[PDB]
């Protein structure tokens, strides 16, 4: 399972064959593998990669020079990439080829205390005819004496978004090694400047 830490930079469209293809650009700066999990000691296998390089040696407890490219461990921390074990000195974008398909994970935008009927698309009350303090309200939430309670999982109002989201099977449209850049089929969780991870897909 390939995969690399990266940052959503933002989107435009390009032209292919003779059609406008919207793309979101991702910068997947080279990712110094800073630990490898083995099944022997850790139980499972994966590779812990690092991302955003710069750092005023704020390394305190995680001095962890331990692996070669401890090259002052990345701002944007480091994540694992499950079953994956490669050329143990950095992960570029050469990893990917145009045409390939990938799953992308990042952080959906933080919508705050959402209404129902945004959090959930609920129907909401009538803008007229019927009384007037229940336009964006959720209606009933139950029956009566049986069960005499509300069910677990009831779609209701609250903190919505600012959560992990993996959108799946995106086309890789082009790869610029020169700049550690990466183009895909547009519309990836999260805002620009935002952290993402980028793995080979599951249609196989």
């Amino acid at each position: 399972m390939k995969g690399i830490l990266g940052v959503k930079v933002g989107m435009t469209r390009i032209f292919r064959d003779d059609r406008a293809v919207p793309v979101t650009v991702i910068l997947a700066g080279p990712c110094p593998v800073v630990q490898r999990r083995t099944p022997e000691k850790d139980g499972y296998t994966a590779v812990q990669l690092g991302f955003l390089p710069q750092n005023p040696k704020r390394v305190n407890r995680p001095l962890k020079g331990h692996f070669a490219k401890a090259g002052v461990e990345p701002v944007r921390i480091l994540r694992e990439i499950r079953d994956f074990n490669p050329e143990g000195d950095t992960v570029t974008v050469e990893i990917f080829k145009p045409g390939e398909r990938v799953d992308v994970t990042g952080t959906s935008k933080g919508r705050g205390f959402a209404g129902v009927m945004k959090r959930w698309n609920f129907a909401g009350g009538p803008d007229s005819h019927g009384a007037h303090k229940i336009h964006r309200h959720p209606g009933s939430i139950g029956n009566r004496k049986t069960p005499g309670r509300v069910y677990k999982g009831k779609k209701m109002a609250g903190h919505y978004g600012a959560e992990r989201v993996t959108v799946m099977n995106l086309e890789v449209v082009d790869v610029i090694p020169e700049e550690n850049l990466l183009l895909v089929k547009g519309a990836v969780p999260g805002p620009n400047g935002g952290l993402v991870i980028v793995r080979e897909t599951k249609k196989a």
Binding site: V9, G10, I14, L27, L181
Partner: peptide, 15 residues
């Protein structure tokens, strides 16, 4: 990193 933009400008080379 630095120019979230000027990266993207670089892609538009179908000007």
């Amino acid at each position: 990193m630095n120019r979230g933009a000027l990266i993207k400008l670089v892609e538009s080379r179908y000007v």
